[PDB]
Amino acid sequence: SHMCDAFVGTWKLVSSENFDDYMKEVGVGFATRKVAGMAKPNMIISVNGDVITIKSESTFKNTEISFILGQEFDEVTADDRKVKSTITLDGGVLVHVQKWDGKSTTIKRKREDDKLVVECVMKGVTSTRVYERA
């Protein structure tokens, strides 16, 4: 047993709040916001040694990142941003920072009851995305 045991699994989106505004703040254009906002992704989290993999799969896009905590990596996001990302564990929360074009967004993933809660923040705009086990 280890670092991320309670995150591992297959998770499905069950609720979203303020996601459109988050995507506007990030710079996502109209058509992508509409199609991406309709998606109902599954998030699949696995661990092998020190390497964590997070997949997002939906009718919009399928994405996958693999990383070591605290070790920066280049990421192409589902909306096609080229970002430099770093993911750390801070008090049991996975904290994922993306930097690009002098901008920054922070995405927190936490276990709360039987849910995996994803909080997406950019400047003053937050979106909360709630996932349950598949």
Binding residues for a fatty acid: 129-131
Q: Quick one: 90 exposed, middle or buried, by C-beta within 10 A (0-12, 13-18, 19+)?
A: exposed
Minimum CB distance to ligand WEN, residue 132 (Å): 13
Is 12 within 8 Å of 131 (Cβ atoms)? yes
Give yes or no for residue 87 binding ligand WEN (CB under 6 A): no
- Comparing CB distances to ligand WEN, the nearer of 47 and 63 is 63
* Contact characters 22-61, ligand WEN, x per CB under 6 A: -x--x-x-------x----x--------------x-----
Stretch of 3-11, 44-52, 71-79, 87-95 lying at the interface with ligand WEN (CB under 6 A): 71-79
3-state secondary structure of 7: coil
- CB-based contacts of 55: which residues, under 8 Å, 6+ apart? 42, 43, 44, 45, 62, 63, 64
| Contact call for residues 41 and 13 (beta carbons, < 8 A) | yes
Task: Provide the binding-site residues for ligand WEN, judged by CB under 6 A.
Answer: 23, 26, 28, 36, 41, 56, 77-79, 107, 118, 120, 129
